[PDB]
C-alpha cells in the first residue's frame, strides 16, 4: 500500500506506511541552492540539517515548519513531496490516502494549510488527527476506555497537553514551547552568562549531551563559539548544572501547562490521572529529569513512553490501519 500517515514535525518528520510501519524519520529541513536567481532544492532531510549555520553564499538551509505548523508552504510542499517519493512503492499507481497530525491549538488557517499542502504533494485524500490523540494512541494509553488518560507531547514546535477518554478529547492545549525554544534558551544563556555566541548545531549538542530539567554540578562538555567582545573563537566548559539554569524557563512553561490542564479536568477523570500518572511523549520527553520535574511539581506519577520520538507516528499509523 502507498497509504501513509505523516508526523509532520517542526524538527523531524516521520512517515508510517500502511502495512509496513515506520519507514522514514528525517529532519524537517530543506536546502535551497540559488543558481541563476532562481532557487533549486539541493537537499532534504539529514543532509540539509548538517548545513545549518554552515552555508556558503549561494545556499540556505530552511525549516519550513514553525511552532508546530507550516510557515513556508512552498518549501514544506517540496519537503513533503520529497519524503513521499522516497517511501513510495513504484508498483502502486494510485495517489495515497494521507493521515497527518496537527497541533490541537492550530488555527483554521494553519489546518487548511496542512490539508492543501498534502493535496499539492500528491495525496488523493487527507485526514487530520489531533497530535495529542495520536501521541496517546502511539504511547499505548487506553484512550477508548471510560478512564482519564493524560498525555504531554513535547515536540520541536509545540507541547501538546491533553486528557483523553472514550476515544475523545476531554481537554487539550498546544503550548508554544518545545525543542526549538529550548535550543533558543541555550543560545541566549550562552550569550548572557558566558559572552559567547553559538549556533543551533552547538545548542542542540548541549541540549542532548548535558541538557536537564533540574540541577544534578554533574557532567560537563566543552563547546566552541564566538567570543562576543573580541569576535574570535573561544571555548567554554558547560555543566549539567548550567544547562539546567539555561532550560529553566521553557521547562517551567511545560510544568505550568500540566498544572493548568489538571485544574481544568473533571474530578473523576482527574482522580484516574492521579492513579495512573501522566505520560510523556515526543523528543522533549527525553530531556533528563523532565519526568521528575513534572512529578515533583504536580505530585503525580510521570512516565516516559516507549519510543517517545515515534509515538505520534505510531498513533497516526494505528488510525490509518
mmCIF file of C-alpha atoms in Angstrom:
data_model
loop_
_atom_site.group_PDB
_atom_site.id
_atom_site.type_symbol
_atom_site.label_atom_id
_atom_site.label_comp_id
_atom_site.label_asym_id
_atom_site.label_seq_id
_atom_site.Cartn_x
_atom_site.Cartn_y
_atom_site.Cartn_z
ATOM 1 C CA UNK A 1 0.000 0.000 0.000
ATOM 2 C CA UNK A 2 1.050 3.611 -0.596
ATOM 3 C CA UNK A 3 -1.371 4.885 2.052
ATOM 4 C CA UNK A 4 0.643 6.694 4.712
ATOM 5 C CA UNK A 5 0.446 8.641 7.950
ATOM 6 C CA UNK A 6 2.704 11.653 8.457
ATOM 7 C CA UNK A 7 4.011 13.146 11.685
ATOM 8 C CA UNK A 8 4.817 16.478 10.071
ATOM 9 C CA UNK A 9 7.080 17.919 12.728
ATOM 10 C CA UNK A 10 8.724 21.281 13.320
ATOM 11 C CA UNK A 11 12.043 19.472 13.768
ATOM 12 C CA UNK A 12 11.525 15.958 12.439
ATOM 13 C CA UNK A 13 9.119 14.305 10.026
ATOM 14 C CA UNK A 14 8.131 10.640 10.315
ATOM 15 C CA UNK A 15 6.154 8.527 7.888
ATOM 16 C CA UNK A 16 4.234 5.391 8.760
ATOM 17 C CA UNK A 17 3.321 3.232 5.769
ATOM 18 C CA UNK A 18 0.129 1.180 5.836
ATOM 19 C CA UNK A 19 1.130 -2.451 6.304
ATOM 20 C CA UNK A 20 4.805 -1.705 6.999
ATOM 21 C CA UNK A 21 5.137 0.609 9.994
ATOM 22 C CA UNK A 22 7.558 3.500 10.337
ATOM 23 C CA UNK A 23 9.547 3.776 7.115
ATOM 24 C CA UNK A 24 11.045 7.257 7.352
ATOM 25 C CA UNK A 25 12.294 9.578 10.083
ATOM 26 C CA UNK A 26 14.185 12.652 8.845
ATOM 27 C CA UNK A 27 14.851 16.237 9.942
ATOM 28 C CA UNK A 28 12.315 18.705 8.559
ATOM 29 C CA UNK A 29 14.956 20.729 6.706
ATOM 30 C CA UNK A 30 15.331 21.802 3.089
ATOM 31 C CA UNK A 31 18.495 23.180 1.434
ATOM 32 C CA UNK A 32 17.952 25.514 -1.495
ATOM 33 C CA UNK A 33 20.792 26.444 -3.853
ATOM 34 C CA UNK A 34 20.405 29.778 -5.620
ATOM 35 C CA UNK A 35 21.513 29.267 -9.213
ATOM 36 C CA UNK A 36 20.502 31.826 -11.833
ATOM 37 C CA UNK A 37 18.495 33.950 -9.414
ATOM 38 C CA UNK A 38 16.083 31.029 -9.137
ATOM 39 C CA UNK A 39 16.181 28.541 -6.267
ATOM 40 C CA UNK A 40 16.573 24.796 -6.693
ATOM 41 C CA UNK A 41 16.015 22.196 -3.953
ATOM 42 C CA UNK A 42 19.532 20.992 -3.193
ATOM 43 C CA UNK A 43 18.884 18.506 -0.389
ATOM 44 C CA UNK A 44 16.150 17.449 2.044
ATOM 45 C CA UNK A 45 16.492 15.754 5.428
ATOM 46 C CA UNK A 46 19.654 14.852 7.315
ATOM 47 C CA UNK A 47 21.967 16.251 4.621
ATOM 48 C CA UNK A 48 20.236 19.641 4.833
ATOM 49 C CA UNK A 49 20.233 19.659 8.641
ATOM 50 C CA UNK A 50 24.007 19.223 8.601
ATOM 51 C CA UNK A 51 24.247 22.556 6.717
ATOM 52 C CA UNK A 52 22.613 24.753 9.383
ATOM 53 C CA UNK A 53 24.849 27.675 10.281
ATOM 54 C CA UNK A 54 27.457 26.447 7.788
ATOM 55 C CA UNK A 55 26.168 27.522 4.344
ATOM 56 C CA UNK A 56 28.244 29.458 1.769
ATOM 57 C CA UNK A 57 26.815 32.438 -0.138
ATOM 58 C CA UNK A 58 24.520 30.784 -2.650
ATOM 59 C CA UNK A 59 22.960 28.264 -0.301
ATOM 60 C CA UNK A 60 20.431 28.317 2.509
ATOM 61 C CA UNK A 61 19.086 25.650 4.840
ATOM 62 C CA UNK A 62 15.428 26.306 5.634
ATOM 63 C CA UNK A 63 12.986 24.880 8.183
ATOM 64 C CA UNK A 64 9.576 25.396 6.573
ATOM 65 C CA UNK A 65 7.681 24.428 9.774
ATOM 66 C CA UNK A 66 7.468 26.720 12.802
ATOM 67 C CA UNK A 67 5.647 26.387 16.147
ATOM 68 C CA UNK A 68 4.124 23.086 15.017
ATOM 69 C CA UNK A 69 2.624 24.312 11.728
ATOM 70 C CA UNK A 70 3.538 25.130 8.121
ATOM 71 C CA UNK A 71 5.178 28.528 7.787
ATOM 72 C CA UNK A 72 6.681 28.413 4.263
ATOM 73 C CA UNK A 73 4.108 26.475 2.251
ATOM 74 C CA UNK A 74 6.205 26.299 -0.955
ATOM 75 C CA UNK A 75 9.220 24.759 0.773
ATOM 76 C CA UNK A 76 7.105 22.481 3.031
ATOM 77 C CA UNK A 77 5.416 21.111 -0.108
ATOM 78 C CA UNK A 78 8.805 20.361 -1.699
ATOM 79 C CA UNK A 79 9.802 18.683 1.570
ATOM 80 C CA UNK A 80 6.632 16.590 1.761
ATOM 81 C CA UNK A 81 6.863 15.656 -1.933
ATOM 82 C CA UNK A 82 10.440 14.517 -1.415
ATOM 83 C CA UNK A 83 9.659 12.349 1.634
ATOM 84 C CA UNK A 84 6.616 10.793 -0.063
ATOM 85 C CA UNK A 85 8.546 9.963 -3.225
ATOM 86 C CA UNK A 86 11.239 8.402 -1.038
ATOM 87 C CA UNK A 87 8.908 5.875 0.609
ATOM 88 C CA UNK A 88 6.666 5.404 -2.453
ATOM 89 C CA UNK A 89 6.139 1.864 -3.793
ATOM 90 C CA UNK A 90 6.782 2.103 -7.567
ATOM 91 C CA UNK A 91 4.319 -0.742 -8.227
ATOM 92 C CA UNK A 92 1.473 1.446 -6.947
ATOM 93 C CA UNK A 93 -0.190 3.812 -9.436
ATOM 94 C CA UNK A 94 -2.810 5.348 -7.183
ATOM 95 C CA UNK A 95 -2.383 8.556 -5.168
ATOM 96 C CA UNK A 96 -2.140 7.768 -1.437
ATOM 97 C CA UNK A 97 -4.636 8.456 1.315
ATOM 98 C CA UNK A 98 -2.793 10.501 3.922
ATOM 99 C CA UNK A 99 -3.344 10.951 7.634
ATOM 100 C CA UNK A 100 -1.395 13.881 9.096
ATOM 101 C CA UNK A 101 -1.123 15.093 12.691
ATOM 102 C CA UNK A 102 -1.886 18.700 13.624
ATOM 103 C CA UNK A 103 -1.376 20.626 16.892
ATOM 104 C CA UNK A 104 -4.617 20.829 18.861
ATOM 105 C CA UNK A 105 -4.298 24.628 19.023
ATOM 106 C CA UNK A 106 -3.698 25.009 15.261
ATOM 107 C CA UNK A 107 -5.874 27.776 13.739
ATOM 108 C CA UNK A 108 -8.379 27.213 10.938
ATOM 109 C CA UNK A 109 -5.813 28.850 8.633
ATOM 110 C CA UNK A 110 -2.994 26.533 9.754
ATOM 111 C CA UNK A 111 -5.113 23.378 9.374
ATOM 112 C CA UNK A 112 -6.211 24.365 5.906
ATOM 113 C CA UNK A 113 -2.541 24.803 5.002
ATOM 114 C CA UNK A 114 -1.565 21.274 6.034
ATOM 115 C CA UNK A 115 -4.510 19.905 4.038
ATOM 116 C CA UNK A 116 -3.768 21.958 0.913
ATOM 117 C CA UNK A 117 -0.071 21.159 1.178
ATOM 118 C CA UNK A 118 -0.559 17.394 1.390
ATOM 119 C CA UNK A 119 -3.006 17.526 -1.529
ATOM 120 C CA UNK A 120 -0.485 19.554 -3.544
ATOM 121 C CA UNK A 121 2.147 16.955 -2.715
ATOM 122 C CA UNK A 122 0.117 14.136 -4.265
ATOM 123 C CA UNK A 123 -2.352 12.940 -1.635
ATOM 124 C CA UNK A 124 -5.698 11.864 -3.044
ATOM 125 C CA UNK A 125 -7.344 12.392 0.344
ATOM 126 C CA UNK A 126 -6.100 13.981 3.578
ATOM 127 C CA UNK A 127 -7.363 13.315 7.096
ATOM 128 C CA UNK A 128 -6.197 15.341 10.106
ATOM 129 C CA UNK A 129 -5.724 13.865 13.574
ATOM 130 C CA UNK A 130 -5.001 15.881 16.726
ATOM 131 C CA UNK A 131 -1.357 15.414 17.795
ATOM 132 C CA UNK A 132 -2.025 14.555 21.443
ATOM 133 C CA UNK A 133 -4.597 11.937 20.423
ATOM 134 C CA UNK A 134 -2.042 10.391 18.054
ATOM 135 C CA UNK A 135 0.629 10.555 20.745
ATOM 136 C CA UNK A 136 -1.564 8.886 23.351
ATOM 137 C CA UNK A 137 -2.542 6.101 20.937
ATOM 138 C CA UNK A 138 1.102 5.605 19.985
ATOM 139 C CA UNK A 139 2.151 5.501 23.651
ATOM 140 C CA UNK A 140 -0.394 2.759 24.293
ATOM 141 C CA UNK A 141 -2.737 4.674 26.602
ATOM 142 C CA UNK A 142 -6.279 3.213 26.954
ATOM 143 C CA UNK A 143 -7.897 6.115 25.080
ATOM 144 C CA UNK A 144 -11.056 4.138 24.221
ATOM 145 C CA UNK A 145 -11.883 3.294 27.829
ATOM 146 C CA UNK A 146 -14.065 5.226 30.287
ATOM 147 C CA UNK A 147 -10.989 6.411 32.177
ATOM 148 C CA UNK A 148 -8.932 9.594 32.208
ATOM 149 C CA UNK A 149 -5.538 9.451 30.493
ATOM 150 C CA UNK A 150 -3.210 12.446 30.357
ATOM 151 C CA UNK A 151 -0.547 12.809 27.687
ATOM 152 C CA UNK A 152 2.090 15.513 27.267
ATOM 153 C CA UNK A 153 3.768 15.523 23.859
ATOM 154 C CA UNK A 154 6.838 17.753 23.811
ATOM 155 C CA UNK A 155 7.643 18.342 20.142
ATOM 156 C CA UNK A 156 10.005 20.616 18.255
ATOM 157 C CA UNK A 157 7.481 23.431 17.914
ATOM 158 C CA UNK A 158 4.742 22.812 20.477
ATOM 159 C CA UNK A 159 3.974 20.991 23.672
ATOM 160 C CA UNK A 160 0.576 19.283 23.494
ATOM 161 C CA UNK A 161 -1.198 18.558 26.783
ATOM 162 C CA UNK A 162 -4.422 16.552 26.635
ATOM 163 C CA UNK A 163 -6.787 14.473 28.707
ATOM 164 C CA UNK A 164 -8.432 11.680 26.727
ATOM 165 C CA UNK A 165 -11.407 9.430 27.486
ATOM 166 C CA UNK A 166 -13.752 7.232 25.468
ATOM 167 C CA UNK A 167 -11.931 7.863 22.150
ATOM 168 C CA UNK A 168 -12.215 11.629 22.550
ATOM 169 C CA UNK A 169 -10.609 14.756 23.957
ATOM 170 C CA UNK A 170 -11.692 15.913 27.399
ATOM 171 C CA UNK A 171 -9.179 18.763 27.403
ATOM 172 C CA UNK A 172 -6.346 19.772 25.121
ATOM 173 C CA UNK A 173 -3.897 22.642 24.757
ATOM 174 C CA UNK A 174 -0.987 23.479 22.481
ATOM 175 C CA UNK A 175 1.776 25.447 24.222
ATOM 176 C CA UNK A 176 4.473 27.182 22.105
ATOM 177 C CA UNK A 177 7.400 25.521 23.828
ATOM 178 C CA UNK A 178 9.411 22.555 22.667
ATOM 179 C CA UNK A 179 12.817 21.573 21.348
ATOM 180 C CA UNK A 180 13.336 24.739 19.306
ATOM 181 C CA UNK A 181 12.569 27.071 22.252
ATOM 182 C CA UNK A 182 14.927 25.056 24.418
ATOM 183 C CA UNK A 183 17.691 25.439 21.819
ATOM 184 C CA UNK A 184 16.938 29.177 21.712
ATOM 185 C CA UNK A 185 17.076 29.280 25.519
ATOM 186 C CA UNK A 186 20.545 27.650 25.430
ATOM 187 C CA UNK A 187 21.770 30.145 22.796
ATOM 188 C CA UNK A 188 20.532 33.008 24.978
ATOM 189 C CA UNK A 189 22.103 31.577 28.138
ATOM 190 C CA UNK A 190 25.493 31.264 26.415
ATOM 191 C CA UNK A 191 25.333 34.853 25.207
ATOM 192 C CA UNK A 192 24.111 36.371 28.507
ATOM 193 C CA UNK A 193 26.112 34.349 31.039
ATOM 194 C CA UNK A 194 29.218 33.480 29.028
ATOM 195 C CA UNK A 195 29.580 36.263 26.445
ATOM 196 C CA UNK A 196 29.607 33.556 23.784
ATOM 197 C CA UNK A 197 27.680 33.316 20.528
ATOM 198 C CA UNK A 198 26.877 29.760 19.488
ATOM 199 C CA UNK A 199 24.908 28.365 16.578
ATOM 200 C CA UNK A 200 21.958 25.971 16.546
ATOM 201 C CA UNK A 201 24.010 22.803 15.990
ATOM 202 C CA UNK A 202 26.030 23.509 19.117
ATOM 203 C CA UNK A 203 22.916 24.345 21.139
ATOM 204 C CA UNK A 204 21.412 21.041 20.012
ATOM 205 C CA UNK A 205 24.564 19.243 21.192
ATOM 206 C CA UNK A 206 24.414 20.938 24.599
ATOM 207 C CA UNK A 207 20.716 20.035 24.956
ATOM 208 C CA UNK A 208 21.353 16.408 24.010
ATOM 209 C CA UNK A 209 24.564 15.770 25.943
ATOM 210 C CA UNK A 210 24.028 17.664 29.221
ATOM 211 C CA UNK A 211 20.515 19.088 28.974
ATOM 212 C CA UNK A 212 18.403 18.563 32.082
ATOM 213 C CA UNK A 213 15.140 19.804 33.603
ATOM 214 C CA UNK A 214 16.760 20.108 37.036
ATOM 215 C CA UNK A 215 20.205 20.574 38.598
ATOM 216 C CA UNK A 216 22.028 17.266 39.242
ATOM 217 C CA UNK A 217 27.277 20.088 39.066
ATOM 218 C CA UNK A 218 27.035 16.844 37.070
ATOM 219 C CA UNK A 219 28.909 16.181 33.821
ATOM 220 C CA UNK A 220 30.359 18.917 31.605
ATOM 221 C CA UNK A 221 31.256 19.356 27.969
ATOM 222 C CA UNK A 222 33.452 21.827 26.095
ATOM 223 C CA UNK A 223 31.751 23.945 23.480
ATOM 224 C CA UNK A 224 33.129 26.416 20.984
ATOM 225 C CA UNK A 225 31.630 29.687 19.864
ATOM 226 C CA UNK A 226 32.412 33.316 19.152
ATOM 227 C CA UNK A 227 33.691 35.477 21.999
ATOM 228 C CA UNK A 228 31.260 38.380 21.717
ATOM 229 C CA UNK A 229 33.632 41.090 22.937
ATOM 230 C CA UNK A 230 36.665 40.103 20.821
ATOM 231 C CA UNK A 231 34.964 38.380 17.892
ATOM 232 C CA UNK A 232 37.347 35.405 17.966
ATOM 233 C CA UNK A 233 36.756 31.676 18.557
ATOM 234 C CA UNK A 234 36.564 30.757 22.236
ATOM 235 C CA UNK A 235 35.939 27.539 24.133
ATOM 236 C CA UNK A 236 33.823 27.232 27.294
ATOM 237 C CA UNK A 237 33.168 24.266 29.585
ATOM 238 C CA UNK A 238 29.475 23.948 30.478
ATOM 239 C CA UNK A 239 27.969 21.663 33.147
ATOM 240 C CA UNK A 240 24.605 19.905 33.543
ATOM 241 C CA UNK A 241 24.032 22.378 36.343
ATOM 242 C CA UNK A 242 24.447 25.290 33.952
ATOM 243 C CA UNK A 243 22.328 23.591 31.290
ATOM 244 C CA UNK A 244 19.551 23.344 33.881
ATOM 245 C CA UNK A 245 19.842 27.105 34.531
ATOM 246 C CA UNK A 246 19.533 27.731 30.784
ATOM 247 C CA UNK A 247 16.496 25.453 30.362
ATOM 248 C CA UNK A 248 14.657 26.658 33.476
ATOM 249 C CA UNK A 249 12.256 28.939 31.614
ATOM 250 C CA UNK A 250 10.899 26.574 28.949
ATOM 251 C CA UNK A 251 10.811 23.670 31.422
ATOM 252 C CA UNK A 252 8.711 25.846 33.745
ATOM 253 C CA UNK A 253 6.253 26.630 30.959
ATOM 254 C CA UNK A 254 5.713 22.902 30.370
ATOM 255 C CA UNK A 255 5.193 22.211 34.091
ATOM 256 C CA UNK A 256 2.761 25.109 34.317
ATOM 257 C CA UNK A 257 0.803 23.835 31.310
ATOM 258 C CA UNK A 258 0.414 20.446 33.005
ATOM 259 C CA UNK A 259 -0.921 22.069 36.192
ATOM 260 C CA UNK A 260 -3.331 24.211 34.193
ATOM 261 C CA UNK A 261 -4.605 21.066 32.464
ATOM 262 C CA UNK A 262 -5.103 19.211 35.763
ATOM 263 C CA UNK A 263 -7.050 22.173 37.188
ATOM 264 C CA UNK A 264 -9.356 22.055 34.168
ATOM 265 C CA UNK A 265 -10.056 18.326 34.486
ATOM 266 C CA UNK A 266 -13.327 16.940 35.988
ATOM 267 C CA UNK A 267 -12.892 15.226 39.384
ATOM 268 C CA UNK A 268 -13.424 11.595 38.345
ATOM 269 C CA UNK A 269 -11.002 11.896 35.417
ATOM 270 C CA UNK A 270 -8.503 13.869 37.478
ATOM 271 C CA UNK A 271 -8.573 11.023 40.006
ATOM 272 C CA UNK A 272 -7.906 8.459 37.249
ATOM 273 C CA UNK A 273 -4.854 10.533 36.320
ATOM 274 C CA UNK A 274 -3.715 10.711 39.963
ATOM 275 C CA UNK A 275 -3.803 6.911 39.983
ATOM 276 C CA UNK A 276 -2.024 6.063 36.738
ATOM 277 C CA UNK A 277 0.027 9.204 36.195
ATOM 278 C CA UNK A 278 0.971 11.378 33.253
ATOM 279 C CA UNK A 279 2.531 10.022 30.052
ATOM 280 C CA UNK A 280 5.358 11.964 28.292
ATOM 281 C CA UNK A 281 5.989 11.623 24.559
ATOM 282 C CA UNK A 282 7.981 13.452 21.889
ATOM 283 C CA UNK A 283 11.633 14.439 21.593
ATOM 284 C CA UNK A 284 11.278 16.663 24.642
ATOM 285 C CA UNK A 285 10.315 13.679 26.792
ATOM 286 C CA UNK A 286 13.951 12.574 26.546
ATOM 287 C CA UNK A 287 15.083 15.664 28.436
ATOM 288 C CA UNK A 288 16.806 14.241 31.505
ATOM 289 C CA UNK A 289 14.835 14.867 34.677
ATOM 290 C CA UNK A 290 11.774 16.309 32.925
ATOM 291 C CA UNK A 291 9.566 13.457 34.157
ATOM 292 C CA UNK A 292 10.849 14.054 37.717
ATOM 293 C CA UNK A 293 10.435 17.820 37.487
ATOM 294 C CA UNK A 294 6.813 17.357 36.438
ATOM 295 C CA UNK A 295 6.300 14.692 39.131
ATOM 296 C CA UNK A 296 7.661 16.903 41.922
ATOM 297 C CA UNK A 297 5.556 19.931 40.932
ATOM 298 C CA UNK A 298 2.293 18.048 40.420
ATOM 299 C CA UNK A 299 2.645 15.246 42.979
ATOM 300 C CA UNK A 300 1.558 12.786 40.294
ATOM 301 C CA UNK A 301 3.415 9.859 38.795
ATOM 302 C CA UNK A 302 5.036 10.592 35.452
ATOM 303 C CA UNK A 303 6.091 8.025 32.864
ATOM 304 C CA UNK A 304 8.138 8.410 29.665
ATOM 305 C CA UNK A 305 6.540 6.494 26.788
ATOM 306 C CA UNK A 306 8.383 3.720 24.976
ATOM 307 C CA UNK A 307 9.856 5.155 21.768
ATOM 308 C CA UNK A 308 8.756 8.715 22.569
ATOM 309 C CA UNK A 309 10.041 10.166 19.251
ATOM 310 C CA UNK A 310 7.819 7.717 17.397
ATOM 311 C CA UNK A 311 4.578 7.859 19.420
ATOM 312 C CA UNK A 312 2.723 10.370 17.252
ATOM 313 C CA UNK A 313 3.610 8.473 14.072
ATOM 314 C CA UNK A 314 2.653 5.109 15.605
ATOM 315 C CA UNK A 315 -0.681 6.545 16.711
ATOM 316 C CA UNK A 316 -1.373 8.060 13.293
ATOM 317 C CA UNK A 317 -0.424 4.692 11.789
ATOM 318 C CA UNK A 318 -2.841 2.892 14.107
ATOM 319 C CA UNK A 319 -5.688 5.122 12.888
ATOM 320 C CA UNK A 320 -4.578 4.563 9.285
ATOM 321 C CA UNK A 321 -4.737 0.824 9.971
#
